[PDB]
Amino acid sequence: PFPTFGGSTGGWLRAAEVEEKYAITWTSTKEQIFEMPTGGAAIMRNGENLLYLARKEQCLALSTQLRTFKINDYKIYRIFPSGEVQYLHPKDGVFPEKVNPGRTSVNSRGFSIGKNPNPASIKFSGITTYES
Amino acid sequence: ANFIKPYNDDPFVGHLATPITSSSLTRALLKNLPAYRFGLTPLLRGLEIGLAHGYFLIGPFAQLGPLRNSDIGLLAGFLSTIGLILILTLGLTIYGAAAFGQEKSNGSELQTKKSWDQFKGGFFVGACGSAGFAFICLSSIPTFAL
Amino acid sequence: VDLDYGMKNSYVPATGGDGGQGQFGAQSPNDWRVAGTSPVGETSYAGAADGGEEPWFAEAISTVSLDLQKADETLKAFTKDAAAFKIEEFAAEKPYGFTSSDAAMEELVGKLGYSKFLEMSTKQLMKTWGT
Amino acid sequence: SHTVKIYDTCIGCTQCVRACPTDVLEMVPWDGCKSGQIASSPRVEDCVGCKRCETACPTDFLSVRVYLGAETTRSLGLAY
Amino acid sequence: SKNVQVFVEKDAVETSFAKWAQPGHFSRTLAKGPKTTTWIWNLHADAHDFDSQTSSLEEVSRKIFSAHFGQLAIIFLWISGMHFHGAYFSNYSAWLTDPISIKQSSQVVWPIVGQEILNADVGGNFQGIQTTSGWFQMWRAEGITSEVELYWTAIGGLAMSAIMLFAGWFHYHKAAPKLEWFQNAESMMNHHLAGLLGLGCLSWSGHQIHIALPINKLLDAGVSPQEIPLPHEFLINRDLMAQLYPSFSKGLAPFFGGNWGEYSDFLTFKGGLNPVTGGLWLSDIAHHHLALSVLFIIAGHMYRTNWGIGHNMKEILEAHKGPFTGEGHKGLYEILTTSWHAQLAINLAMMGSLSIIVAHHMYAMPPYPYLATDYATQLSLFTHHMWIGGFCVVGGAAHGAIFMVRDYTPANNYNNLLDRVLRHRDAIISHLNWVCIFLGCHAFGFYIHNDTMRALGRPQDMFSDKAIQLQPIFAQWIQNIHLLAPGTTAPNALATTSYAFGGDVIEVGGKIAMMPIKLGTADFMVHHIHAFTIHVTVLILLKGVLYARSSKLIPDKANLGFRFPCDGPGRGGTCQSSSWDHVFLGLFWMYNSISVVIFHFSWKMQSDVWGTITPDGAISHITGGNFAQSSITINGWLRDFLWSQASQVIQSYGSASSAYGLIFLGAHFIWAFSLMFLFSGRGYWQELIESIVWAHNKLNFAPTIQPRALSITQGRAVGLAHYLLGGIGTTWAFFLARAISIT
Amino acid sequence: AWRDEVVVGITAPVGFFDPLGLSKGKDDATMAYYREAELKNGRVAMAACLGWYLNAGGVHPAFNSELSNDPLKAMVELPAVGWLQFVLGCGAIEWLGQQIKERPGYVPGDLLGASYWVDNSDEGWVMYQNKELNNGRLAMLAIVGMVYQDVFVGDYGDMMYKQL
Ligand code: CLA
Ligand code: CLA
Ligand code: CLA
Ligand code: CLA
Ligand SMILES: CC1=C(/C=C/C(C)=C/C=C/C(C)=C/C=C/C=C(C)/C=C/C=C(C)/C=C/C2=C(C)CCCC2(C)C)C(C)(C)CCC1
Ligand SMILES: CC1=C(/C=C/C(C)=C/C=C/C(C)=C/C=C/C=C(C)/C=C/C=C(C)/C=C/C2=C(C)CCCC2(C)C)C(C)(C)CCC1
């Protein structure tokens, strides 16, 4: 289900084969030309499409472009060398910009930025003021 | 006709199959080079590589060195080459230690500690000997005249 | 699917100045520091791809890929808890002639697929499951 | 890697989560603001340190603060 | 109907002063009003970016056409002023009588505050600043003779300036052409290549054949300017012309018949330089323009317009495709007919490249009477045109990048040459990086090697013509080819195109005009350094164009724009990653490149060409031939060039050359001043401003337009600007002061 | 059968040209040898022609243009060391060529391995290949003609188009 592309010297390297790799998938209603983050132009297929990239940002950048084409069914995965796959985005099925009941707060401090502790107070502690 | 295609038919790998990258000439040359040739033992691989690199290195030193115009210029050139070979050998030793570690098992895989050590040894012998051969050859140059 | 495969990495968070393993782990379990190319008929990066007659470009031979079928499974597994919360709330709001959570899930996902199910409010779900 | 913290001064404008280039931020339910939503940083392991989020915050002083820290392949944006 | 027609909208924009009183009207954002000092700076930086001011190509196009008329008006006023100043504030008449002794001057300073010292005793009972633009020589070649004529050409210039300004107003406010009119490349090229250039050359040839040639012959012979017949007299009395050139007697009869040979009297292929004036023979120049005219007029009939015959550029471009280049040149026509930035890129690069060529060809083959012996003018012109060229070339690259970020559309460019280039960008940049390193290490290494050797008392180990030698064999060969060409490969010619390749020494007034320039080891070393500098400049600029839209580091650079400060402190640091920043860095390297080139010219000429020759054969060059053994080491350049040739500026105080000394110092100051903008950051300055504002507030007063520090991008721009001004300014004074003395 | 498959080499002026029928009973291997020989002999001829022309013209900027303009005299003047390098170098390439030939899928004459990207289905490819062959065939005859002129007639320059 690979989109039609002729190849580039800006594709993935060894890290994709020995450390980690990424993959995005989407469905289209027409064959159209899009610009790939790696560099160049490609033609998507009329239906399912799969593409591999080396960075999550590269994948999410393409998603932005896809939204312009009115495609909002994209999914991003991380494939480890052993074959293990992790579903990353949309994580809970709902885009992050939309509040979804069932998501808990993380890394939240209940005070204004100016209420953090003084650096000297936490000296020889190992923690930082913003983590204190 | 398109003479440039995606490498290995993977449109997303960062490489292309150009005439330079994948031509019968390039494939043939690289396949038979000592580094990638099939069947050569680690020692022999190093030996061939060393023999090749030592012979051409004596030239630069002998003809352009500080004592080039001296009667002992060629001798000095030889010594200089040996010095350079030693430096390069140190590098090979150090690389192996860092890249491969301290104890190995696979064996006969240029990419293991034991194999690398053997490879390094071959390089040293070949390089130094090759430089010596050049010394003997450059001692008397033939005019090939009848 | 081992949902902790990524978390199970060699990374050890430091005391101060580190976000941590986050949600999906901070680093790959595998070490990128592998060797270089090898002679014909030999392998280097463990489960590497044989370069055949072109060992010099072996790293360009892909061996890591995503199975579309397998892709479905990873989607379901990583989103299992979310689905659970969703159905639970639907159950709490006095479902019409409710049966079993799982049963309801199957019925509700039989229609509206699964992705649509994950993106629907309990109200919409109840409207959908009115029948 | 990097540390992102959200403070009580948030107003749930969602602008930050719409600017992250690597999906590190999310909008979670909350009651301290009229919007009834607050931002969270569930996946800081993918923060590159761009600080685009901070540039988008409308509060007097950023309600979202990014403190750069330990660097990994992901945080250093290395595709190689 | 007709493919090519004229479409114009009447009364498009009302003329009023309302918008004038509403600064920032062009922009939606700026129009709201000033709230901080940034608004002021932004107003000036977005003034001529029409693409951001409107979304319609027609509107953008209309503005550009009118704006161009404005530039033309300014240029005309400039030329007019020069001629006027040459009519009322010059010593042209005296110089005309004795060109060898009197010094050219066309600017006079008022007697205020001792500035009068700047009025030098140039000659001809006149005191003024010695100009170096070469106006006098040009006027002599045209056959001006009088100062009344200069006055009239000045009046014509003023009139022309006004006409252009009216045209600008008319074609923007009263009769604005529509987009369809602008998009007619074939017609434009036919007209510009046959009318602007072809007819232009032919007209000039007419002036040269009927007015300039005859007058200049009389001048050279010795006839006093006052005794030479007025220009109109030559045009009317054919007999007078027949006396000088004995072929006008036959009339135009030979021309209509095929006997063009009879006109050999005034149309010639002599080559070389006139012995008396030291300039190219005007007869040859006349044939030159006549020949070029024919060529251009013929070329203007290549593209289709409204009569079927001709070529359509689109078809030509699309047909040229090959096995290694996919769809080939498909898609380029649309780009160049729908993007002003793309057009500017190509046009600007070529224009700059031409200027550099003019500099080289205009010294080797002096084109004006009494120009070569005027070393000051020669040096000034070479350096001036070398600079103009460098800036333009870098500018072309900049606008090329703006295209990629603003006008490039993936859909219209599939598998075309552009697409394929952006698909192997890594390979291109990687290889160029290596080429730059190779050249740089080897080329500059030669100099460092030599310095070390000479310092260690080992002169026999240097790369010199007296030791290990690196001779420019290829160039030496071409020189011989060109020297022996006359009479062989160029049978009808009579002499070398330039005496630089080889020949005798042409001297005018006891001073050497041209002499064979030889190439040795030093020349090899310097030429290869030029290659290194140019190559590095290309690397920075090309990288900017290729990686303008995206990169592995920032995959979405396009959305950020062409001129963004950075993406953030993340990814290890993303400072200066925009295409604008690549142009910023490229200009610094262009400065270096051009500086070395101009220095090469100055030392080589003053050492191996310029000088004096005795009645017998004794050549004394200005510096004495030091270039061969001194330019092979860096210490040599610092001592035998900069330190020694700067004795003039530093010792100019108390003389008419005092201005150069002051400017030399002032330029150094500005150069250093810039380093504070290039090394510092906005943060420190903003905080400092806060404290300063505290003081004003403490006294119950503060500006509503809150004072803010300059933007990151502006900081860099201000720094580069001052850096360039200072550096170029310093050399300007150095060269001019030295030249005045050597002349 | 080679005759039933060959496409390159058969052109318009004469079509298949084997008046003496020297390929009637030959097998594919022999025919392959012939084609390879034809191409090699022709390609070398083309190169030789260019070399002769340049030397004769006088553009021999080597050894301070010491060697004679006559190509055949120059060869005698060349030191043997120069000739040895030539033969040995060509020999090396010949070895590599043998390696390529052994590899499966070898098309007689292809050392760049263009078979990897293009096949004879493409008319452009076959046509360009024909141009090489046709020019090579002509060059072979020419080099033989020129030598005759230089050795017997006594001239080593164009005696055909020289008269403007
Ligand atoms: C004198 C000051 C100076 C020097 C030496 C350099 C040097 C360099 N700049 Mg640079 N630059 C400078 C000022 C300078 N810059 C300034 C002020 C700016 C601001 C505008 C820039 C902006 C700039 C950019 C934007 C770019 C460069 C690039 C380069 C590189 C060109 C490649 C090359 O020739 O490598 C050779 C380097 C040398 C220094 C040659 C001399 C070294 C010796 C003689 C050669 C042999 C030494 C050997 C390798 C090791 C010896 C061992 C022993 C000494 C320990 C090179 C490293 C380009 C680059 O990286 O692309 C390749 C590039 O893109 N520069
Ligand atoms: C490229 C164009 C150019 C340049 C650079 C110069 C430069 C010079 N000219 Mg010259 N000139 C030119 C064109 C030019 N001229 C033309 C086309 C003519 C024909 C009309 C003349 C006629 C001319 C004469 C007749 C004289 C000069 C003189 C001079 C010198 C003194 C200038 C001066 O008046 O200072 C002083 C400047 C002023 C008195 C002007 C006052 C400053 C004004 C008020 C500031 C501008 C106000 C501002 C724009 C308001 C904006 C309002 C808004 C609507 C835009 C100076 C070297 C003089 C000279 O050399 O004497 C020895 C002199 O006598 N020129
Ligand atoms: C044919 C020539 C030409 C033309 C028509 C343009 C036109 C344009 N360029 Mg461009 N450019 C050119 C040549 C040209 N350029 C060259 C040669 C370079 C290389 C230096 C550049 C580099 C360049 C950059 C880097 C950028 C542009 C931009 C632009 C656009 C907006 C310009 C602007 O902001 O106006 C306002 C103009 C100014 C503020 C200039 C004022 C003059 C400043 C203050 C310098 C003055 C120096 C002065 C001579 C020194 C006097 C010393 C004395 C005081 C002692 C516009 C489409 C910008 C853009 O956004 O494009 C879309 C942009 O970012 N160009
Ligand atoms: C190296 C020499 C050489 C060789 C090996 C070939 C081989 C071939 N040619 Mg060929 N050819 C040559 C030179 C050669 N050619 C020259 C110089 C010309 C120009 C006249 C041609 C013109 C030509 C045409 C027009 C055609 C061929 C074809 C063929 C192929 C089928 C015919 C055949 O079997 O010929 C067998 C040939 C040989 C086994 C060797 C040739 C016999 C040798 C040279 C004996 C020497 C005879 C000669 C008179 C020597 C004196 C030369 C000079 C002193 C006058 C075959 C592969 C046909 C083809 O491509 O079909 C697929 C075809 O249509 N050839
Ligand atoms: C350009 C080119 C090429 C290449 C070339 C080259 C690169 C060459 C090189 C070469 C070389 C580089 C060679 C080498 C050689 C070496 C040798 C020959 C050695 C020897 C040695 C020996 C023989 C021995 C020694 C010893 C030892 C081992 C030890 C003990 C002692 C002794 C002494 C015994 C060719 C032509 C292909 C083709 C075209 C391209
Ligand atoms: C310096 C200057 C200027 C200029 C002036 C002038 C340039 C004057 C002149 C004018 C003129 C004086 C012009 C003229 C022209 C002429 C012509 C252009 C001619 C043409 C020709 C023709 C058109 C012909 C045709 C024909 C033929 C081809 C043959 C047959 C017959 C007939 C008739 C058909 C001004 C002031 C502006 C400004 C300042 C600077």
From Swiss-Prot, chain B:
> Which InterPro entries does the entry link to?
PSI_PsaL, PSI_PsaL_sf, PSI_suXI
What does the similarity note say? Belongs to the PsaL family.
Q: Name one GO cellular component term.
A: photosystem I reaction center
**Topology in membrane:** Multi-pass membrane protein
The record's subcellular locations are:
Plastid, Chloroplast thylakoid membrane
Q: Give the organism, scientific name.
A: Thalassiosira pseudonana (Marine diatom)
Q: Does the keyword Chloroplast apply?
A: yes
Q: Which keywords accompany this UniProt record?
A: Chloroplast, Membrane, Photosynthesis, Photosystem I, Plastid, Thylakoid, Transmembrane, Transmembrane helix
Per the UniProt record, which residue ranges are transmembrane? 47-67, 72-92, 121-141
- Which GO terms are recorded in the biological process aspect for this UniProt protein? photosynthesis
- Give the protein name, as stated in the record: Photosystem I reaction center subunit XI
Q: Which Gene3D superfamilies match?
A: Photosystem I PsaL, reaction centre subunit XI
Domain of life the protein comes from: Eukaryota
From Swiss-Prot, chain D:
Q: Where does it localize?
A: Plastid, Chloroplast thylakoid membrane
Q: Name one GO cellular component term.
A: chloroplast thylakoid membrane
Tell me which cofactor or cofactors this protein depends on.
[4Fe-4S] cluster
UniProt cofactor note: Binds 2 [4Fe-4S] clusters. Cluster 2 is most probably the spectroscopically characterized electron acceptor FA and cluster 1 is most probably FB.
Reaction equations catalysed: reduced [plastocyanin] + hnu + oxidized [2Fe-2S]-[ferredoxin] = oxidized [plastocyanin] + reduced [2Fe-2S]-[ferredoxin]
GO MF: 4 iron, 4 sulfur cluster binding; electron transfer activity; metal ion binding; oxidoreductase activity
* GO terms for biological process, alphabetical: photosynthetic electron transport in photosystem I
Keyword Lipoprotein applies: no
Q: Does the keyword Thylakoid apply?
A: yes
| InterPro entries from the UniProt entry | 4Fe4S_Fe-S-bd, 4Fe4S_Fe_S_CS, PSI_iron-sulfur_center, PSI_PsaC
Subunit info here reads: The eukaryotic PSI reaction center is composed of at least 11 subunits.
Name under which the protein is recorded: Photosystem I iron-sulfur center
User: What organism is listed for this UniProt entry?
Assistant: Thalassiosira pseudonana
Gene this chain is encoded by = psaC
From Swiss-Prot, chain E:
Catalyzed reaction equations = reduced [plastocyanin] + hnu + oxidized [2Fe-2S]-[ferredoxin] = oxidized [plastocyanin] + reduced [2Fe-2S]-[ferredoxin]
S-S bonds: none
Q: Where does chlorophyll a' bind?
A: H668
Record-annotated membrane-spanning stretches: 64-87, 150-173, 189-213, 285-303, 340-363, 379-405, 427-449, 524-542, 582-603, 657-679, 717-737
Domain of life of the source: Eukaryota
Report quaternary structure and partners. Answer: The PsaA/B heterodimer binds the P700 chlorophyll special pair and subsequent electron acceptors. PSI consists of a core antenna complex that captures photons, and an electron transfer chain that converts photonic excitation into a charge separation. The eukaryotic PSI reaction center is composed of at least 11 subunits.
State the name under which the record lists this protein. Photosystem I P700 chlorophyll a apoprotein A1
